[PDB]
């Protein structure tokens, strides 16, 4: 009549599970799919005030502006950790976890839906004003710590106690200043205001984010399951996890809460994440010899003494030779090596 | 190799009436010989070490 077909062959689930279930010994072919999320923060002002920054400061002069931490929305990261797969790996066939895909979504967003709560009145009978203006969302996933690069306008503020900010505002800190390099290491700590993943370097991490600025821009925002985002980088290969550990990081602050007093304050909301880990085949680039350096020079002996190197070298002169030649003529003579070729010159 | 013990003989108990613990020692003697391991850990787990 009609033969039931044989099904598909699909992707054979070993085990579902917390972090943990990661363990498992599986094969060089495995992969896993990772469902973690982070909250975000905002500043987070009272122990009731989850998802926003401290009410908001407008004017305030340059000089004298001494924004507190908990007006501070900052950036929000973690770290996951893998099971390190060289366990019982053969030879010198050295494996790591590589990122390959990332689904994203910012959760909560219909919550914005309660006009009424604490909301200032559209108008005469109107419901709340919901939350609108400037917006910034952004996130990264990598395999390595997000590094980052600090600007700012008003480089003369005074930053809160808690909070990691460029070290040493000049102007050039309102626009390029290298000196502004950093890393997202800890979480709450850096202000969004201050930083933002520097281009010039994030080699193994990919981000995305946009600024959309306004008085009163309104937030667009979908959820859906149905999207992947794709980390391979040009030669397919996504982040690999150096470390035995996967970072994300993220933020988004959806924009600004107006208080029935009609003060603002940013509102935020968690993010979601789906990464997609496989084990990537890759190579030491390093040699044995300097992997060992570390044991010995970090383990034997170190020693103060008159100075053999820098512009203080006791060393006078150093001869280096192989094989043999015919009896040369000047003995003073040089040779040296420029950036390839030797030379042979006189001394004078 | 690792060795622990513990040894309350029970308690003395002073003329006064006071009783205070009593232990004594231990002696051991270990036997050991040589095993052959899987190594645990390899050179693959330097450099992920090293990184990390």
Redesign the interface.
Known sequence: PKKPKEPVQVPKLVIKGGIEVLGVKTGVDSFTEVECFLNPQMGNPDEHQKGLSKSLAAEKQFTDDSPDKEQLPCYSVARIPLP?I??D?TC???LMWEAVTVKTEVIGVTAMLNLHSGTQKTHENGAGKPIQGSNFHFFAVGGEPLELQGVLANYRTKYPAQTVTPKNATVDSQQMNTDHKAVLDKDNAYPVECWVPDPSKNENTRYFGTYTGGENVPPVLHITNTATTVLLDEQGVGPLC????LYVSAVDICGLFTNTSGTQQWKGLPRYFKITLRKRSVK?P?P?SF?LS?LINRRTQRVDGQPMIGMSSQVEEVRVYEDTEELPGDPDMIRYIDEFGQTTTRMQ
């Open positions: 390190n060289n366990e790996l010198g066939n050295i150096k470390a035995d550990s030491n390093y044995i992997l570390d």
